[PDB]
Antibody
């Protein structure tokens, strides 16, 4: 497969700098133009810039230059983005993106995208979440189903990853978008629905990871 | 400062043709803009669909095609499928730089579905910490519009709840919604009946789910 693994994100303080990086495999990286794109929370895409194979053409979004430096190291199949003079507006998901060029066809497509690395600019400190069960009841069924879940509460910054039974359980799962509370901390819930008669049939454990605070939690959700 | 604009949201039925457009504030979108389209699906999964206005990318289903209509660039989906639920972004090349539009949510239409509703009392573990969250779940409904009202001992609650909705499910085309009512432990102990009341087009009258504290 083509793989584009980003890293280097997390919490940064206002004014400070940060270096994102991106390692590529599954294609001849040497030959391809590379791009960085970002997406602030609940907003659209914003092109940052692009670099050609030999690092001689580096084009940037003008309305914010002298701030982002793009480079690449073709021997390490790696792309870099240096951020400086950081403000809250720079808080976003940053995507490593491959640009397929084709001058004959008149063709330029952003074809493979990395998953992105999260950057938050804030002087607020990290906070791990508390994880609370949302217990199901045999007596509280609706539309032929029983619901159970986890409340992942009071964390900062985004993101948390949530899964059920180490990823083995995916049918019926909904992890909801995190909400920002008036305290300045985030909160989210993840739920599983199952056919009512299957409730006692298996164990449900929600796995909650929060990398910025190094929190890992496995919470068993017992019917109650 | 070039601004690219797209429709916010469109709805289409399976098998129907739908056309997304992309306009510019500099004037007509032209071949020299090299219009590109990108599709975004949940978990931020991006796929380049169209390059150079009307060139479909390798691996991309024939169902998708790109063109110009008058002023604008256009992405046509001929025979929309449930898996086409996504956000579609167009991007115009200009001078050196590339500028994205704001994106268009594509909703796939389906028959109205009422939500299943569930209410969860706070866990004994949370109550140890001094606060109490009551969660209400609205599962697998369509269309999206849905009212949730919280009541405590029959009193309408205001400005102490938050709400969150999933993206349209790519399979059953439904939405789900989660709502949290937060109060302090002390305030939670003063009241008996906690209710979640839900109106939706698929319900002929509102559904209430409730529980009694300590029962």
């Amino acid at each position: 497969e083509v793989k584009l693994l980003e890293s280097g994100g997390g919490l940064a303080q206002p004014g400070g700098s940060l270096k994102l990086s991106c390692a590529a495999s599954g294609f001849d990286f040497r030959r391809y133009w590379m791009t960085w794109v970002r997406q602030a929370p609940g907003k659209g895409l914003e092109w940052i810039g692009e670099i050609n194979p030999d690092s001689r053409t580096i084009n940037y979004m003008p309305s914010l230059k002298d701030k982002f430096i793009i480079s690449r190291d073709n021997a390490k199949n790696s792309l870099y983005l240096q951020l400086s003079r950081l403000r809250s507006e720079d808080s976003a998901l940053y995507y490593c993106v491959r640009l397929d060029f084709d001058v004959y066809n008149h063709y330029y497509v952003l074809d493979y995208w990395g998953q992105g690395t999260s950057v938050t600019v804030s002087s607020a400190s990290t906070k791990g979440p508390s994880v609370f069960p949302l217990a199901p009841s045999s007596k509280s069924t609706s539309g032929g189903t029983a619901a159970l879940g986890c409340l992942v509460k009071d964390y900062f910054p985004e993101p948390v990853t949530v899964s059920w039974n180490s990823g083995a359980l995916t049918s019926g799962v909904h992890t909801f978008p995190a909400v920002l509370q008036s305290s300045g901390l985030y909160s989210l819930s993840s739920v599983v629905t199952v056919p009512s008669s299957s409730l006692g049939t298996q164990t449900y454990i929600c796995n909650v990871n929060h990398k910025p605070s190094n929190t890992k939690v496995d919470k068993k959700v017992e019917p109650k | 400062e070039l601004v690219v604009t797209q429709e916010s949201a469109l709805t289409t039925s399976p098998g129907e043709t739908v056309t997304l457009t992309c306009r510019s504030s500099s004037g007509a979108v032209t071949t020299s803009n090299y219009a590109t389209w990108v599709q975004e699906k949940p978990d931020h999964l991006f796929t380049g669909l169209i390059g150079g206005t009307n060139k479909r990318a390798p691996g991309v289903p024939a169902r998708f095609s790109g063109s110009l209509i008058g002023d604008r660039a256009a992405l046509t989906i001929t025979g929309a499928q449930t898996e086409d639920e996504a956000i579609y972004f167009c991007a115009l090349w200009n001078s050196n730089h590339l500028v994205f539009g704001g994106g268009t949510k594509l909703e796939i239409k389906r028959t109205v579905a009422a939500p299943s509703v569930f209410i969860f009392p706070p866990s004994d573990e949370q109550l140890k910490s001094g606060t109490a969250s009551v969660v209400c779940l609205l599962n697998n409904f369509y269309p999206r519009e849905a009212k949730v009202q919280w009541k405590v001992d029959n009193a309408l609650q205001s400005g102490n709840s938050q709400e969150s909705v999933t993206e349209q499910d790519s399979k059953d085309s439904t939405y789900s919604l989660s709502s949290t009512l937060t109060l302090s432990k002390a305030d939670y102990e003063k009241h008996k009946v906690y209710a979640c009341e839900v109106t939706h087009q698929g319900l002929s009258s509102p559904v209430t789910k409730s529980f009694n504290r300590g029962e």
